[PDB]
């Protein structure tokens, strides 16, 4: 009995070199910006969203929005893709730069750096399956180099980026690309670490005068050392409409921080062979 | 000499082929017939027998 | 395509014969191999298997333990898979008494290594453990075999048997006077900033309450010590910044009916639990609350 795919076509004639390489990705994890049963090969995978002044900030966002596929079977003139649903179990091709193990919870990261398939000016760039916590690592560290990007005349500042830079996990190094390129840093993250540092500057100032008065009727006795930490941070160094506009503006920075303070599991490991190319997994949606 | 005679002790492995005698209907074995368990991975399932 | 074929009842998946009974009609072949009922077939639970040297199975040899990965800070045994009573003895909410008998369990080069594993690194429990299912199968040997279920029932191969999960008692929590009808488990470690090494305590929490915000502002209310703790562990100790007092997780769901107490018996020691008797396991992740 047949089961709910997804055609997909060419519109570029296909070699049988390109058909052959094709299954090959025969469990890749292909995603689509939207619900459709027939597609065009131009929708598959990030070609379409890249662009030569923004980043990883804007492609993590993107990637948040689609639809996650896996190829399911090549043919002549068609490829069939499956959209999985949640709590059923799923073979998953390893393509990140990490080797897998049972248990691990997979999320989906835009790729930092035979070959994979180019048409014309067309590219099947798929995206990264990582465990969760070298992508939480992976996204501090690019945070953190691009908050570092105005000191860059430094040697010691280049070698602090540069100990930021490398990363490693399991039985695997790789250096992540700097987020500053043409010696300037493009516009997503400058937006992301203009945020951060705004809600921080915000919290320094605004917190104090809320934190006295709810701490004068703080049962829990917690809000008293909230304040007096903030005594001690204050030691170490308005108009109604105004106050409501830094407030605002606090919360606005903290919604626009919200797509890299979190990240979504998409899978869970088990199964492990020296095809570890790749592996079976549960989907979570 | 230094004032001790140690001495050496060490294990050799050998390769070998033996022989088993037994006799008539010294054992039954009972048995019955095989059956199958699925546990289906995605791409392709596995048929224990 | 047709309004007869829309209008047709689906096949019964049941009703038809198998691959394996397809194919040997089509040629008309006769196998040895018995094919035409197969076991696990209809089993709607996911599973996998999971290879445990025989000194970490004391406790789990009975179906119902629930099985958490830990990562070793070493390259070679990467992990070790521990179940939530090894784990019980580093726990501080376990009365002395239950932490000796436990200590007097598990008494091997596997479970002391563990249990260093554990303490070695600075990291926290849960930024070093990873929850795997619960246990149902065990075969025994010097290299053990444990299969555990990552979503689904606990149950035999015919279902003809639905296996429990086991809580160790000082573990066990409850919040409300009165249970409703269904009421979701969460695995919880809470840290207590006392001095010179933070303190861990581990819970299980069978509540009602599915909403996240509700349950960690209960959580939040339940633990106030712990807050404090944090707090002033942070204004009294700069420079050692501390993440969470505690982190939820929630796996898996119950009826207020089927819970029960129950004893263990290994080594003719006796472990006093709290089963949950047609626990269905459903994994999130670590949610850390403040």
């Given at each position: 009995?047949?089961?709910?795919?997804?055609?997909?076509?060419?519109?570029?004639?296909?070699?049988?070199?390109?058909?052959?390489?094709?299954?090959?990705?025969?469990?890749?994890?292909?995603?689509?910006?939207?619900?459709?049963?027939?597609?065009?090969?131009?929708?598959?995978?990030?070609?379409?969203?890249?662009?030569?002044?923004?980043?990883?900030?804007?492609?993590?966002?993107?990637?948040?929005?689609?639809?996650?596929?896996?190829?399911?079977?090549?043919?002549?003139?068609?490829?069939?893709?499956?959209?999985?649903?949640?709590?059923?179990?799923?073979?998953?091709?390893?393509?990140?730069?990490?080797?897998?193990?049972?248990?691990?919870?997979?999320?989906?990261?835009?790729?930092?750096?035979?070959?994979?398939?180019?048409?014309?000016?067309?590219?099947?760039?798929?995206?990264?399956?990582?465990?969760?916590?070298?992508?939480?690592?992976?996204?501090?560290?690019?945070?953190?180099?691009?908050?570092?990007?105005?000191?860059?005349?430094?040697?010691?500042?280049?070698?602090?980026?540069?100990?930021?830079?490398?990363?490693?996990?399991?039985?695997?190094?790789?250096?992540?690309?700097?987020?500053?390129?043409?010696?300037?840093?493009?516009?997503?993250?400058?937006?992301?670490?203009?945020?951060?540092?705004?809600?921080?500057?915000?919290?320094?100032?605004?917190?104090?005068?809320?934190?006295?008065?709810?701490?004068?009727?703080?049962?829990?006795?917690?809000?008293?050392?909230?304040?007096?930490?903030?005594?001690?941070?204050?030691?170490?160094?308005?108009?109604?409409?105004?106050?409501?506009?830094?407030?605002?503006?606090?919360?606005?920075?903290?919604?626009?921080?919200?797509?890299?303070?979190?990240?979504?599991?998409?899978?869970?490991?088990?199964?492990?062979?020296?095809?570890?190319?790749?592996?079976?997994?549960?989907?979570?949606? | 000499?230094?004032?001790?005679?140690?001495?050496?002790?060490?294990?050799?492995?050998?390769?070998?082929?033996?022989?088993?005698?037994?006799?008539?209907?010294?054992?039954?074995?009972?048995?019955?017939?095989?059956?199958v368990t699925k546990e289906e991975r995605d791409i392709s399932t596995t048929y224990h027998v | 395509m047709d309004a007869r074929a829309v209008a047709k009842r689906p096949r019964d998946p049941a009703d038809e014969d198998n691959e394996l009974v397809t194919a040997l009609k089509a040629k008309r072949e006769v196998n040895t191999i018995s094919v035409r009922y197969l076991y696990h077939a209809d089993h709607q639970a996911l599973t996998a298997r999971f290879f445990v040297p025989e000194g970490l199975v004391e406790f789990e040899?009975?179906?119902?333990?629930?099985?958490?990965?830990?990562?070793?800070?070493?390259?070679?045994?990467?992990?070790?898979?521990?179940?939530?009573?090894?784990?019980?003895?580093?726990?501080?909410?376990?009365?002395?008494?239950?932490?000796?008998?436990?200590?007097?369990?598990?008494?091997?080069?596997?479970?002391?290594?563990?249990?260093?594993?554990?303490?070695?690194?600075?990291?926290?429990?849960?930024?070093?453990?990873?929850?795997?299912?619960?246990?149902?199968?065990?075969?025994?040997?010097?290299?053990?075999?444990?299969?555990?279920?990552?979503?689904?029932?606990?149950?035999?191969?015919?279902?003809?048997?639905?296996?429990?999960?086991?809580?160790?008692?000082?573990?066990?929590?409850?919040?409300?006077?009165?249970?409703?009808?269904?009421?979701?488990?969460?695995?919880?470690?809470?840290?207590?900033?006392?001095?010179?090494?933070?303190?861990?305590?581990?819970?299980?929490?069978?509540?009602?309450?599915?909403?996240?915000?509700?349950?960690?502002?209960?959580?939040?209310?339940?633990?106030?010590?712990?807050?404090?703790?944090?707090?002033?562990?942070?204004?009294?100790?700069?420079?050692?910044?501390?993440?969470?007092?505690?982190?939820?997780?929630?796996?898996?769901?119950?009826?207020?009916?089927?819970?029960?107490?129950?004893?263990?018996?290994?080594?003719?020691?006796?472990?006093?639990?709290?089963?949950?008797?047609?626990?269905?396991?459903?994994?999130?992740?670590?949610?850390?609350?403040?």
């Amino acid at each position: 009995a047949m089961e709910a795919n997804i055609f997909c076509t060419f519109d570029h004639k296909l070699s049988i070199a390109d058909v052959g390489k094709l299954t090959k990705l025969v469990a890749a994890v292909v995603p689509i910006p939207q619900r459709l049963h027939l597609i065009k090969h131009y929708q598959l995978g990030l070609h379409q969203f890249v662009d030569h002044t923004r980043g990883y900030v804007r492609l993590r966002g993107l990637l948040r929005n689609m639809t996650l596929t896996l190829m399911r079977r090549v043919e002549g003139n068609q490829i069939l893709l499956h959209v999985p649903t949640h709590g059923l179990l799923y073979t998953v091709l390893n393509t990140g730069p990490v080797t897998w193990e049972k248990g691990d919870a997979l999320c989906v990261l835009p790729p930092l750096f035979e070959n994979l398939l180019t048409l014309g000016q067309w590219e099947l760039v798929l995206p990264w399956i990582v465990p969760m916590p070298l992508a939480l690592e992976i996204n501090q560290r690019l945070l953190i180099m691009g908050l570092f990007s105005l000191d860059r005349s430094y040697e010691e500042v280049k070698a602090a980026v540069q100990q930021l830079q490398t990363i490693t996990f399991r039985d695997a190094t790789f250096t992540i690309p700097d987020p500053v390129i043409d010696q300037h840093l493009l516009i997503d993250m400058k937006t992301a670490c203009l945020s951060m540092s705004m809600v921080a500057n915000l919290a320094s100032e605004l917190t104090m005068t809320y934190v006295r008065k709810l701490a004068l009727e703080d049962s829990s006795m917690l809000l008293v050392k909230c304040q007096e930490l903030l005594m001690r941070l204050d030691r170490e160094r308005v108009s109604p409409d105004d106050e409501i506009a830094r407030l605002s503006a606090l919360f606005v920075m903290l919604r626009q921080l919200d797509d890299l303070i979190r990240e979504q599991v998409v899978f869970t490991v088990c199964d492990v062979s020296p095809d570890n190319k790749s592996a079976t997994c549960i989907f979570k949606g | 000499h230094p004032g001790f005679a140690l001495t050496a002790v060490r294990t050799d492995t050998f390769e070998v082929d033996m022989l088993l005698y037994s006799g008539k209907s010294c054992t039954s074995v009972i048995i019955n017939n095989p059956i199958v368990t699925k546990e289906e991975r995605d791409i392709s399932t596995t048929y224990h027998v | 395509m047709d309004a007869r074929a829309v209008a047709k009842r689906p096949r019964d998946p049941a009703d038809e014969d198998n691959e394996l009974v397809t194919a040997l009609k089509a040629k008309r072949e006769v196998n040895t191999i018995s094919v035409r009922y197969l076991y696990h077939a209809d089993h709607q639970a996911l599973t996998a298997r999971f290879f445990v040297p025989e000194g970490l199975v004391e406790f789990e040899a009975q179906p119902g333990a629930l099985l958490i990965r830990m990562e070793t800070g070493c390259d070679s045994p990467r992990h070790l898979y521990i179940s939530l009573y090894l784990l019980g003895i580093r726990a501080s909410n376990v009365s002395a008494s239950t932490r000796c008998l436990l200590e007097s369990v598990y008494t091997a080069s596997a479970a002391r290594a563990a249990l260093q594993w554990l303490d070695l690194g600075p990291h926290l429990l849960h930024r070093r453990l990873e929850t795997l299912g619960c246990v149902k199968t065990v075969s025994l040997g010097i290299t053990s075999l444990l299969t555990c279920v990552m979503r689904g029932y606990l149950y035999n191969t015919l279902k003809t048997e639905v296996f429990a999960l086991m809580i160790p008692k000082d573990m066990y929590l409850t919040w409300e006077e009165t249970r409703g009808r269904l009421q979701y488990v969460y695995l919880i470690i809470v840290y207590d900033y006392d001095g010179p090494e933070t303190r861990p305590g581990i819970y299980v929490l069978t509540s009602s309450i599915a909403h996240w915000q509700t349950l960690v502002d209960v959580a939040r209310g339940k633990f106030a010590r712990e807050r404090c703790s944090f707090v002033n562990r942070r204004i009294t100790r700069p420079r050692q910044i501390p993440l969470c007092t505690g982190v939820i997780q929630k796996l898996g769901w119950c009826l207020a009916d089927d819970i029960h107490t129950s004893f263990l018996v290994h080594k003719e020691l006796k472990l006093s639990v709290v089963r949950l008797d047609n626990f269905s396991v459903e994994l999130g992740d670590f949610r850390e609350f403040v």
